[PDB]
Amino acid sequence: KKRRRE
Amino acid sequence: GKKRRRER
Amino acid sequence: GTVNWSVEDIVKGINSNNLESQLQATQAARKLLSREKQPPIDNIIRAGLIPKFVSFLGKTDCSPIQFESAWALTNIASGTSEQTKAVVDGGAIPAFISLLASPHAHISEQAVWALGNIAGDGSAFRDLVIKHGAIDPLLALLAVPDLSTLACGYLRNLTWTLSNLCRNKNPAPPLDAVEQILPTLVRLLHHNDPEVLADSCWAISYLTDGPNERIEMVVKKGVVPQLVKLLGATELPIVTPALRAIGNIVTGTDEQTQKVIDAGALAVFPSLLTNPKTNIQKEATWTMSNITAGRQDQIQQVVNHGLVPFLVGVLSKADFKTQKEAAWAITNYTSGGTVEQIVYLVHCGIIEPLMNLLSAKDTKIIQVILDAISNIFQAAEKLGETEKLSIMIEECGGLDKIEALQRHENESVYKASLNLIEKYFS
């Protein structure tokens, strides 16, 4: 679910 | 800024 | 008398083997390299001067020429990667590290600055500065009982150079260098100068931009409460990196995210999600989307802090990039939330602004919204109230947009819309 997508 | 120029 | 010399005259003075002539010509080069417009960096490189400047860094008996050459080389290193490389190729890295111990504060400061430009070029020069041993002497300059006794400009330059040792990826900085710097960074993050605070936050934001283990090295030092405090600063140059660091941290484990919540961060989000700076709203909404990807008890704290109406607000009206983060925040919420939490979303007014964003010519936000609708319907099934939801979607023009998407080109999009129509609208 987490997105390292700034 | 990654780099800095010293002007004075 | 050193104003606007030609490069030719600089070369003639530097090649004279009269130290005082060399000093005057090196100052003339420094002034050229310091001018407002188009400093002639390539012409100075092409004249062959970098080796001479580097040898002048070593002239302990002529501190003025150490200073002038350090400033000249700093400004060359401030340029493109190729210009920084020319300085590194001349042997400048060990020569500057040796000047960190100078008894002249203005020379040590200039060496700090030059190494910041070198390390700031990229991961390889950063790691090469570290291998030549820069961290110990840099950290020794800050080993004072109270940072307030240092000159403000000097402390700002040190903080900035340390932030460049923390910057860049592929690879990230060596783990042992990060462990070595972090306690000094924690102390700088509590200093009262706004520029020191901003660059300390930037450094923390770089160190948390990475896998969970890098996040944990930072979070374990106990900085999250100070970051949350800075999240409420009035200075936008502090809020911006503080929020980037907080957002990086909540990309980590649910326990790391809980430390952000425990420190009070959610109480700042009413203002961040309405902030006049578009970039702050966007980063705040992205951060919210990684919090709504958490546990049901973390979703519940988002609810308790009154943040679902603020997400409805950003979905209704914001820059499109922010609206897209808001759509993600809603899909994450509906994917992880309880039935009661999802119901609450609808009572807050999520459906109409969600439907309105189906007019967007962005394929992934359409996929995101369709996923949310399906999740909301599934919660409605368990309550036996899908028809109430269908009518809601129909009254605000959403059914039209969903039907039209059956003829949308992306197969993932038309399959999702087909299922919705087949399942709940007939």
Side-chain angles (χ1 to χ4, degrees), chain A residues 2-4 6, chain B residues 1 3-8, chain C residues 1-36 38-360 362-406 408-410 412-413 416-417 419-422 424-426:
Chain A
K2 304 288 203 170
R3 295 179 310 126
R4 330 194 101 97
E6 212 88 43
Chain B
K3 293 176 190 177
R4 286 170 183 188
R5 192 166 59 95
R6 183 179 177 162
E7 294 195 45
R8 58 197 44 92
Chain C
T2 55
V3 172
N4 194 50
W5 287 27
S6 67
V7 169
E8 180 181 46
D9 281 352
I10 289 163
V11 169
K12 186 77 182 185
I14 277 161
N15 291 339
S16 65
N17 297 318
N18 175 321
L19 178 56
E20 185 63 32
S21 294
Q22 294 178 309
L23 164 63
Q24 294 183 19
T26 302
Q27 178 177 89
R30 175 269 284 192
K31 290 184 178 175
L32 266 191
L33 292 164
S34 294
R35 81 181 179 198
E36 192 179 1
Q38 293 189 313
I41 292 165
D42 286 334
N43 282 340
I44 294 291
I45 294 176
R46 284 201 274 284
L49 290 168
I50 282 169
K52 275 282 151 66
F53 292 152
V54 169
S55 74
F56 296 159
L57 299 179
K59 289 188 171 308
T60 312
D61 257 25
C62 185
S63 80
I65 204 170
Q66 296 184 308
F67 179 58
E68 296 292 346
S69 56
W71 186 344
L73 290 163
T74 295
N75 282 9
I76 294 169
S78 79
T80 62
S81 291
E82 191 188 356
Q83 287 165 350
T84 307
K85 174 178 178 298
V87 173
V88 174
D89 289 1
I93 292 176
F96 279 127
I97 291 169
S98 298
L99 283 183
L100 294 172
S102 178
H104 306 286
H106 65 288
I107 288 176
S108 172
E109 180 182 32
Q110 200 57 56
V112 171
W113 191 331
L115 290 165
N117 278 342
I118 290 165
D121 178 73
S123 293
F125 282 165
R126 174 199 72 201
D127 291 347
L128 186 58
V129 166
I130 292 170
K131 276 192 177 291
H132 282 78
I135 291 178
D136 285 342
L138 289 168
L139 298 178
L141 295 169
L142 299 166
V144 299
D146 182 1
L147 296 174
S148 287
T149 65
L150 298 173
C152 172
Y154 192 88
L155 182 61
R156 282 162 179 186
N157 268 319
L158 281 154
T159 304
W160 172 75
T161 288
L162 289 174
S163 73
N164 275 352
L165 296 171
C166 295
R167 190 202 302 260
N168 286 122
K169 291 166 71 172
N170 309 304
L175 284 171
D176 67 291
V178 177
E179 294 285 8
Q180 201 182 349
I181 287 166
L182 258 169
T184 293
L185 187 52
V186 174
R187 184 175 180 213
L188 296 167
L189 197 68
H190 283 79
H191 184 60
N192 63 334
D193 179 73
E195 283 181 50
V196 171
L197 290 171
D199 285 332
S200 298
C201 283
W202 279 115
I204 291 295
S205 80
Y206 307 147
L207 298 177
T208 52
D209 185 355
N212 294 353
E213 294 72 20
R214 300 289 177 146
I215 295 175
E216 180 69 10
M217 304 169 64
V218 171
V219 167
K220 185 186 192 176
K221 297 287 173 182
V223 303
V224 167
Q226 180 71 357
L227 289 174
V228 171
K229 176 167 176 314
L230 295 177
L231 195 65
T234 68
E235 303 92 332
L236 175 67
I238 297 170
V239 180
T240 295
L243 175 56
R244 291 174 61 83
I246 287 298
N248 291 342
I249 289 159
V250 302
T251 71
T253 67
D254 295 331
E255 291 79 9
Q256 290 162 344
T257 300
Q258 190 61 38
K259 298 197 121 38
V260 175
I261 298 168
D262 288 346
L266 296 171
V268 196
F269 276 72
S271 293
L272 297 171
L273 298 169
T274 52
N275 190 288
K277 296 303 174 103
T278 285
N279 182 254
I280 295 296
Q281 264 181 53
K282 186 187 71 189
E283 292 270 325
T285 303
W286 169 68
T287 298
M288 290 302 316
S289 77
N290 282 318
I291 294 170
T292 62
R295 308 183 309 241
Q296 297 179 340
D297 63 296
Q298 299 173 324
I299 294 167
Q300 185 64 36
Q301 300 192 263
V302 166
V303 168
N304 295 345
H305 277 86
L307 296 184
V308 168
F310 284 95
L311 293 176
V312 173
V314 154
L315 202 65
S316 301
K317 182 187 172 71
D319 184 89
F320 176 72
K321 285 183 147 185
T322 302
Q323 290 183 303
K324 198 177 204 256
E325 300 301 343
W328 273 109
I330 296 308
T331 302
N332 293 348
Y333 180 123
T334 64
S335 178
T338 67
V339 168
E340 175 176 18
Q341 285 168 344
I342 291 167
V343 158
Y344 174 66
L345 267 189
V346 173
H347 293 155
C348 284
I350 205 68
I351 288 298
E352 177 179 326
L354 213 46
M355 291 305 111
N356 289 342
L357 280 172
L358 283 173
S359 304
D362 188 280
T363 287
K364 187 46 180 172
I365 196 190
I366 290 170
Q367 298 167 338
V368 170
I369 297 167
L370 293 176
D371 282 351
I373 297 305
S374 163
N375 294 355
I376 297 170
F377 270 111
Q378 289 172 49
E381 268 162 13
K382 304 183 195 169
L383 295 167
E385 278 153 29
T386 76
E387 189 174 328
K388 296 180 178 178
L389 179 62
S390 299
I391 296 156
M392 281 196 56
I393 292 168
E394 178 180 332
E395 291 171 334
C396 71
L399 188 56
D400 284 4
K401 310 204 186 71
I402 306 180
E403 287 171 343
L405 272 25
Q406 267 160 336
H408 186 268
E409 141 198 8
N410 187 274
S412 168
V413 154
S417 58
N419 189 345
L420 293 168
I421 299 264
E422 297 176 352
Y424 308 109
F425 296 96
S426 67

PDB file of all heavy atoms in Angstrom, chain C residues 62-94:
ATOM      1  N   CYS C  62      51.787  31.469   4.133  1.00  0.00           N
ATOM      2  CA  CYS C  62      51.118  32.581   3.471  1.00  0.00           C
ATOM      3  C   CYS C  62      49.600  32.336   3.556  1.00  0.00           C
ATOM      4  O   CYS C  62      48.972  31.983   2.556  1.00  0.00           O
ATOM      5  CB  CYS C  62      51.570  32.713   1.999  1.00  0.00           C
ATOM      6  SG  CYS C  62      50.861  34.134   1.238  1.00  0.00           S
ATOM      7  N   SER C  63      49.025  32.534   4.733  1.00  0.00           N
ATOM      8  CA  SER C  63      47.607  32.246   4.910  1.00  0.00           C
ATOM      9  C   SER C  63      46.748  33.023   3.915  1.00  0.00           C
ATOM     10  O   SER C  63      45.755  32.462   3.420  1.00  0.00           O
ATOM     11  CB  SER C  63      47.223  32.510   6.383  1.00  0.00           C
ATOM     12  OG  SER C  63      47.025  33.890   6.614  1.00  0.00           O
ATOM     13  N   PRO C  64      47.102  34.244   3.495  1.00  0.00           N
ATOM     14  CA  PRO C  64      46.266  34.912   2.485  1.00  0.00           C
ATOM     15  C   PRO C  64      46.167  34.142   1.160  1.00  0.00           C
ATOM     16  O   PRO C  64      45.096  34.090   0.541  1.00  0.00           O
ATOM     17  CB  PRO C  64      46.983  36.269   2.313  1.00  0.00           C
ATOM     18  CG  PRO C  64      47.572  36.488   3.717  1.00  0.00           C
ATOM     19  CD  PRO C  64      48.137  35.158   4.034  1.00  0.00           C
ATOM     20  N   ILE C  65      47.252  33.529   0.698  1.00  0.00           N
ATOM     21  CA  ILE C  65      47.127  32.826  -0.577  1.00  0.00           C
ATOM     22  C   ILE C  65      46.398  31.490  -0.359  1.00  0.00           C
ATOM     23  O   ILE C  65      45.739  30.994  -1.271  1.00  0.00           O
ATOM     24  CB  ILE C  65      48.520  32.620  -1.259  1.00  0.00           C
ATOM     25  CG1 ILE C  65      48.304  32.450  -2.787  1.00  0.00           C
ATOM     26  CG2 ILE C  65      49.283  31.411  -0.674  1.00  0.00           C
ATOM     27  CD1 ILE C  65      49.632  32.490  -3.600  1.00  0.00           C
ATOM     28  N   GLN C  66      46.457  30.921   0.849  1.00  0.00           N
ATOM     29  CA  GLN C  66      45.606  29.751   1.116  1.00  0.00           C
ATOM     30  C   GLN C  66      44.132  30.109   0.974  1.00  0.00           C
ATOM     31  O   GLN C  66      43.355  29.371   0.339  1.00  0.00           O
ATOM     32  CB  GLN C  66      45.861  29.181   2.524  1.00  0.00           C
ATOM     33  CG  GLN C  66      47.307  28.602   2.748  1.00  0.00           C
ATOM     34  CD  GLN C  66      47.421  27.975   4.153  1.00  0.00           C
ATOM     35  OE1 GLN C  66      47.099  28.626   5.130  1.00  0.00           O
ATOM     36  NE2 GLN C  66      47.822  26.722   4.211  1.00  0.00           N
ATOM     37  N   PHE C  67      43.741  31.245   1.559  1.00  0.00           N
ATOM     38  CA  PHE C  67      42.359  31.709   1.513  1.00  0.00           C
ATOM     39  C   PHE C  67      41.929  31.999   0.089  1.00  0.00           C
ATOM     40  O   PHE C  67      40.866  31.536  -0.353  1.00  0.00           O
ATOM     41  CB  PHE C  67      42.200  32.975   2.390  1.00  0.00           C
ATOM     42  CG  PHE C  67      40.802  33.534   2.364  1.00  0.00           C
ATOM     43  CD1 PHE C  67      39.725  32.735   2.751  1.00  0.00           C
ATOM     44  CD2 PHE C  67      40.563  34.839   1.957  1.00  0.00           C
ATOM     45  CE1 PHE C  67      38.403  33.248   2.739  1.00  0.00           C
ATOM     46  CE2 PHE C  67      39.274  35.373   1.973  1.00  0.00           C
ATOM     47  CZ  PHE C  67      38.188  34.582   2.355  1.00  0.00           C
ATOM     48  N   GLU C  68      42.729  32.800  -0.639  1.00  0.00           N
ATOM     49  CA  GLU C  68      42.357  33.181  -2.007  1.00  0.00           C
ATOM     50  C   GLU C  68      42.229  31.954  -2.917  1.00  0.00           C
ATOM     51  O   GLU C  68      41.289  31.872  -3.728  1.00  0.00           O
ATOM     52  CB  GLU C  68      43.384  34.175  -2.580  1.00  0.00           C
ATOM     53  CG  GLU C  68      43.461  35.511  -1.857  1.00  0.00           C
ATOM     54  CD  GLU C  68      42.245  36.339  -2.023  1.00  0.00           C
ATOM     55  OE1 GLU C  68      41.411  36.035  -2.904  1.00  0.00           O
ATOM     56  OE2 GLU C  68      42.103  37.335  -1.269  1.00  0.00           O
ATOM     57  N   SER C  69      43.193  31.015  -2.848  1.00  0.00           N
ATOM     58  CA  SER C  69      43.094  29.825  -3.692  1.00  0.00           C
ATOM     59  C   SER C  69      41.918  28.962  -3.267  1.00  0.00           C
ATOM     60  O   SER C  69      41.268  28.353  -4.113  1.00  0.00           O
ATOM     61  CB  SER C  69      44.386  28.985  -3.671  1.00  0.00           C
ATOM     62  OG  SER C  69      44.788  28.591  -2.368  1.00  0.00           O
ATOM     63  N   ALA C  70      41.660  28.877  -1.958  1.00  0.00           N
ATOM     64  CA  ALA C  70      40.515  28.056  -1.485  1.00  0.00           C
ATOM     65  C   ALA C  70      39.202  28.612  -2.036  1.00  0.00           C
ATOM     66  O   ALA C  70      38.309  27.864  -2.470  1.00  0.00           O
ATOM     67  CB  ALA C  70      40.492  28.061   0.058  1.00  0.00           C
ATOM     68  N   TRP C  71      39.069  29.940  -2.031  1.00  0.00           N
ATOM     69  CA  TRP C  71      37.867  30.572  -2.564  1.00  0.00           C
ATOM     70  C   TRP C  71      37.778  30.388  -4.081  1.00  0.00           C
ATOM     71  O   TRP C  71      36.719  30.018  -4.619  1.00  0.00           O
ATOM     72  CB  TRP C  71      37.877  32.064  -2.147  1.00  0.00           C
ATOM     73  CG  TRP C  71      36.678  32.886  -2.474  1.00  0.00           C
ATOM     74  CD1 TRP C  71      35.666  32.607  -3.365  1.00  0.00           C
ATOM     75  CD2 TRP C  71      36.412  34.196  -1.941  1.00  0.00           C
ATOM     76  NE1 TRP C  71      34.768  33.699  -3.401  1.00  0.00           N
ATOM     77  CE2 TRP C  71      35.218  34.667  -2.532  1.00  0.00           C
ATOM     78  CE3 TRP C  71      37.073  35.006  -1.000  1.00  0.00           C
ATOM     79  CZ2 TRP C  71      34.663  35.924  -2.203  1.00  0.00           C
ATOM     80  CZ3 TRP C  71      36.531  36.273  -0.689  1.00  0.00           C
ATOM     81  CH2 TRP C  71      35.337  36.707  -1.289  1.00  0.00           C
ATOM     82  N   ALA C  72      38.899  30.605  -4.797  1.00  0.00           N
ATOM     83  CA  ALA C  72      38.897  30.376  -6.232  1.00  0.00           C
ATOM     84  C   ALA C  72      38.471  28.946  -6.549  1.00  0.00           C
ATOM     85  O   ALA C  72      37.615  28.718  -7.418  1.00  0.00           O
ATOM     86  CB  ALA C  72      40.281  30.681  -6.830  1.00  0.00           C
ATOM     87  N   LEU C  73      39.066  27.963  -5.859  1.00  0.00           N
ATOM     88  CA  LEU C  73      38.716  26.556  -6.167  1.00  0.00           C
ATOM     89  C   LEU C  73      37.307  26.212  -5.737  1.00  0.00           C
ATOM     90  O   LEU C  73      36.648  25.389  -6.391  1.00  0.00           O
ATOM     91  CB  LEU C  73      39.688  25.593  -5.487  1.00  0.00           C
ATOM     92  CG  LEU C  73      41.116  25.610  -6.099  1.00  0.00           C
ATOM     93  CD1 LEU C  73      42.084  24.960  -5.106  1.00  0.00           C
ATOM     94  CD2 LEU C  73      41.142  24.817  -7.397  1.00  0.00           C
ATOM     95  N   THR C  74      36.847  26.796  -4.636  1.00  0.00           N
ATOM     96  CA  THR C  74      35.438  26.613  -4.266  1.00  0.00           C
ATOM     97  C   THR C  74      34.532  26.984  -5.434  1.00  0.00           C
ATOM     98  O   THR C  74      33.545  26.285  -5.747  1.00  0.00           O
ATOM     99  CB  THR C  74      35.077  27.479  -3.061  1.00  0.00           C
ATOM    100  OG1 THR C  74      35.809  27.064  -1.885  1.00  0.00           O
ATOM    101  CG2 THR C  74      33.574  27.379  -2.735  1.00  0.00           C
ATOM    102  N   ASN C  75      34.835  28.108  -6.089  1.00  0.00           N
ATOM    103  CA  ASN C  75      33.905  28.603  -7.112  1.00  0.00           C
ATOM    104  C   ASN C  75      34.003  27.820  -8.392  1.00  0.00           C
ATOM    105  O   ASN C  75      32.991  27.637  -9.084  1.00  0.00           O
ATOM    106  CB  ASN C  75      34.149  30.106  -7.342  1.00  0.00           C
ATOM    107  CG  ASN C  75      33.510  30.915  -6.207  1.00  0.00           C
ATOM    108  OD1 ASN C  75      33.076  30.318  -5.234  1.00  0.00           O
ATOM    109  ND2 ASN C  75      33.419  32.217  -6.340  1.00  0.00           N
ATOM    110  N   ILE C  76      35.182  27.325  -8.706  1.00  0.00           N
ATOM    111  CA  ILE C  76      35.293  26.393  -9.829  1.00  0.00           C
ATOM    112  C   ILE C  76      34.474  25.142  -9.525  1.00  0.00           C
ATOM    113  O   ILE C  76      33.731  24.648 -10.382  1.00  0.00           O
ATOM    114  CB  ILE C  76      36.754  26.026 -10.082  1.00  0.00           C
ATOM    115  CG1 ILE C  76      37.524  27.263 -10.567  1.00  0.00           C
ATOM    116  CG2 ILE C  76      36.867  24.905 -11.164  1.00  0.00           C
ATOM    117  CD1 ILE C  76      38.996  26.993 -10.574  1.00  0.00           C
ATOM    118  N   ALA C  77      34.620  24.612  -8.298  1.00  0.00           N
ATOM    119  CA  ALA C  77      33.882  23.382  -7.907  1.00  0.00           C
ATOM    120  C   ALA C  77      32.382  23.609  -7.811  1.00  0.00           C
ATOM    121  O   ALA C  77      31.625  22.631  -7.746  1.00  0.00           O
ATOM    122  CB  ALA C  77      34.398  22.852  -6.544  1.00  0.00           C
ATOM    123  N   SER C  78      31.928  24.865  -7.764  1.00  0.00           N
ATOM    124  CA  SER C  78      30.502  25.187  -7.726  1.00  0.00           C
ATOM    125  C   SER C  78      29.810  24.985  -9.082  1.00  0.00           C
ATOM    126  O   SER C  78      28.581  25.112  -9.154  1.00  0.00           O
ATOM    127  CB  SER C  78      30.277  26.661  -7.292  1.00  0.00           C
ATOM    128  OG  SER C  78      30.515  27.550  -8.388  1.00  0.00           O
ATOM    129  N   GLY C  79      30.563  24.665 -10.139  1.00  0.00           N
ATOM    130  CA  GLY C  79      30.027  24.623 -11.495  1.00  0.00           C
ATOM    131  C   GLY C  79      29.457  23.270 -11.908  1.00  0.00           C
ATOM    132  O   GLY C  79      28.818  22.587 -11.098  1.00  0.00           O
ATOM    133  N   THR C  80      29.656  22.891 -13.166  1.00  0.00           N
ATOM    134  CA  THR C  80      29.167  21.607 -13.673  1.00  0.00           C
ATOM    135  C   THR C  80      29.938  20.456 -13.051  1.00  0.00           C
ATOM    136  O   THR C  80      30.979  20.649 -12.414  1.00  0.00           O
ATOM    137  CB  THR C  80      29.346  21.551 -15.191  1.00  0.00           C
ATOM    138  OG1 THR C  80      30.749  21.649 -15.470  1.00  0.00           O
ATOM    139  CG2 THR C  80      28.616  22.726 -15.837  1.00  0.00           C
ATOM    140  N   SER C  81      29.463  19.224 -13.272  1.00  0.00           N
ATOM    141  CA  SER C  81      30.249  18.073 -12.827  1.00  0.00           C
ATOM    142  C   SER C  81      31.637  18.090 -13.413  1.00  0.00           C
ATOM    143  O   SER C  81      32.594  17.702 -12.746  1.00  0.00           O
ATOM    144  CB  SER C  81      29.536  16.730 -13.214  1.00  0.00           C
ATOM    145  OG  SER C  81      28.391  16.679 -12.390  1.00  0.00           O
ATOM    146  N   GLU C  82      31.767  18.443 -14.700  1.00  0.00           N
ATOM    147  CA  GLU C  82      33.107  18.446 -15.287  1.00  0.00           C
ATOM    148  C   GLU C  82      34.011  19.487 -14.607  1.00  0.00           C
ATOM    149  O   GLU C  82      35.222  19.278 -14.441  1.00  0.00           O
ATOM    150  CB  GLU C  82      32.991  18.715 -16.811  1.00  0.00           C
ATOM    151  CG  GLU C  82      34.329  18.460 -17.575  1.00  0.00           C
ATOM    152  CD  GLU C  82      34.291  18.911 -19.070  1.00  0.00           C
ATOM    153  OE1 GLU C  82      33.225  19.360 -19.567  1.00  0.00           O
ATOM    154  OE2 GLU C  82      35.341  18.822 -19.749  1.00  0.00           O
ATOM    155  N   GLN C  83      33.446  20.616 -14.224  1.00  0.00           N
ATOM    156  CA  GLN C  83      34.254  21.622 -13.538  1.00  0.00           C
ATOM    157  C   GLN C  83      34.638  21.151 -12.123  1.00  0.00           C
ATOM    158  O   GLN C  83      35.776  21.327 -11.695  1.00  0.00           O
ATOM    159  CB  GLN C  83      33.459  22.941 -13.494  1.00  0.00           C
ATOM    160  CG  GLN C  83      33.441  23.560 -14.941  1.00  0.00           C
ATOM    161  CD  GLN C  83      32.404  24.638 -15.109  1.00  0.00           C
ATOM    162  OE1 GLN C  83      31.571  24.836 -14.242  1.00  0.00           O
ATOM    163  NE2 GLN C  83      32.464  25.360 -16.250  1.00  0.00           N
ATOM    164  N   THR C  84      33.699  20.551 -11.401  1.00  0.00           N
ATOM    165  CA  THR C  84      34.061  19.978 -10.096  1.00  0.00           C
ATOM    166  C   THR C  84      35.129  18.902 -10.244  1.00  0.00           C
ATOM    167  O   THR C  84      36.058  18.813  -9.425  1.00  0.00           O
ATOM    168  CB  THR C  84      32.823  19.400  -9.418  1.00  0.00           C
ATOM    169  OG1 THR C  84      31.792  20.394  -9.369  1.00  0.00           O
ATOM    170  CG2 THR C  84      33.156  18.866  -7.998  1.00  0.00           C
ATOM    171  N   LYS C  85      34.991  18.051 -11.268  1.00  0.00           N
ATOM    172  CA  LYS C  85      35.978  16.986 -11.479  1.00  0.00           C
ATOM    173  C   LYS C  85      37.375  17.551 -11.687  1.00  0.00           C
ATOM    174  O   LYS C  85      38.378  16.954 -11.256  1.00  0.00           O
ATOM    175  CB  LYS C  85      35.520  16.139 -12.699  1.00  0.00           C
ATOM    176  CG  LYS C  85      36.585  15.042 -13.123  1.00  0.00           C
ATOM    177  CD  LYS C  85      35.988  14.203 -14.348  1.00  0.00           C
ATOM    178  CE  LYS C  85      36.996  13.159 -14.835  1.00  0.00           C
ATOM    179  NZ  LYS C  85      38.282  13.780 -15.360  1.00  0.00           N
ATOM    180  N   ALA C  86      37.476  18.688 -12.392  1.00  0.00           N
ATOM    181  CA  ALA C  86      38.801  19.280 -12.601  1.00  0.00           C
ATOM    182  C   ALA C  86      39.464  19.624 -11.277  1.00  0.00           C
ATOM    183  O   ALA C  86      40.660  19.397 -11.091  1.00  0.00           O
ATOM    184  CB  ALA C  86      38.691  20.540 -13.487  1.00  0.00           C
ATOM    185  N   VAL C  87      38.675  20.131 -10.315  1.00  0.00           N
ATOM    186  CA  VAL C  87      39.201  20.435  -8.990  1.00  0.00           C
ATOM    187  C   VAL C  87      39.626  19.152  -8.279  1.00  0.00           C
ATOM    188  O   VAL C  87      40.729  19.073  -7.717  1.00  0.00           O
ATOM    189  CB  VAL C  87      38.130  21.205  -8.188  1.00  0.00           C
ATOM    190  CG1 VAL C  87      38.570  21.403  -6.706  1.00  0.00           C
ATOM    191  CG2 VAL C  87      37.936  22.633  -8.867  1.00  0.00           C
ATOM    192  N   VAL C  88      38.736  18.137  -8.271  1.00  0.00           N
ATOM    193  CA  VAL C  88      39.093  16.847  -7.672  1.00  0.00           C
ATOM    194  C   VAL C  88      40.335  16.271  -8.352  1.00  0.00           C
ATOM    195  O   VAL C  88      41.254  15.812  -7.674  1.00  0.00           O
ATOM    196  CB  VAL C  88      37.922  15.866  -7.767  1.00  0.00           C
ATOM    197  CG1 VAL C  88      38.390  14.449  -7.267  1.00  0.00           C
ATOM    198  CG2 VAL C  88      36.754  16.396  -6.886  1.00  0.00           C
ATOM    199  N   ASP C  89      40.384  16.331  -9.686  1.00  0.00           N
ATOM    200  CA  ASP C  89      41.542  15.773 -10.420  1.00  0.00           C
ATOM    201  C   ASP C  89      42.843  16.489 -10.080  1.00  0.00           C
ATOM    202  O   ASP C  89      43.928  15.887 -10.186  1.00  0.00           O
ATOM    203  CB  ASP C  89      41.297  15.828 -11.941  1.00  0.00           C
ATOM    204  CG  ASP C  89      40.243  14.840 -12.404  1.00  0.00           C
ATOM    205  OD1 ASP C  89      39.678  14.128 -11.534  1.00  0.00           O
ATOM    206  OD2 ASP C  89      39.919  14.826 -13.602  1.00  0.00           O
ATOM    207  N   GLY C  90      42.762  17.760  -9.638  1.00  0.00           N
ATOM    208  CA  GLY C  90      43.991  18.421  -9.208  1.00  0.00           C
ATOM    209  C   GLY C  90      44.506  18.058  -7.841  1.00  0.00           C
ATOM    210  O   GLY C  90      45.488  18.656  -7.362  1.00  0.00           O
ATOM    211  N   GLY C  91      43.861  17.107  -7.139  1.00  0.00           N
ATOM    212  CA  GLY C  91      44.293  16.758  -5.778  1.00  0.00           C
ATOM    213  C   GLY C  91      43.673  17.623  -4.674  1.00  0.00           C
ATOM    214  O   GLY C  91      44.179  17.652  -3.546  1.00  0.00           O
ATOM    215  N   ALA C  92      42.585  18.329  -4.959  1.00  0.00           N
ATOM    216  CA  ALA C  92      42.087  19.299  -3.981  1.00  0.00           C
ATOM    217  C   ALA C  92      41.477  18.636  -2.742  1.00  0.00           C
ATOM    218  O   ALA C  92      41.433  19.261  -1.670  1.00  0.00           O
ATOM    219  CB  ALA C  92      41.043  20.212  -4.645  1.00  0.00           C
ATOM    220  N   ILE C  93      40.952  17.407  -2.859  1.00  0.00           N
ATOM    221  CA  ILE C  93      40.214  16.877  -1.705  1.00  0.00           C
ATOM    222  C   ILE C  93      41.108  16.775  -0.458  1.00  0.00           C
ATOM    223  O   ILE C  93      40.750  17.329   0.609  1.00  0.00           O
ATOM    224  CB  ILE C  93      39.530  15.525  -2.019  1.00  0.00           C
ATOM    225  CG1 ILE C  93      38.382  15.690  -3.027  1.00  0.00           C
ATOM    226  CG2 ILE C  93      39.018  14.880  -0.666  1.00  0.00           C
ATOM    227  CD1 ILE C  93      37.704  14.352  -3.464  1.00  0.00           C
ATOM    228  N   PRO C  94      42.254  16.070  -0.500  1.00  0.00           N
ATOM    229  CA  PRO C  94      43.085  15.993   0.730  1.00  0.00           C
ATOM    230  C   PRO C  94      43.625  17.338   1.166  1.00  0.00           C
ATOM    231  O   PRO C  94      43.758  17.593   2.369  1.00  0.00           O
ATOM    232  CB  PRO C  94      44.239  15.014   0.359  1.00  0.00           C
ATOM    233  CG  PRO C  94      44.300  15.040  -1.152  1.00  0.00           C
ATOM    234  CD  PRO C  94      42.824  15.268  -1.622  1.00  0.00           C
TER     235      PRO C  94
END
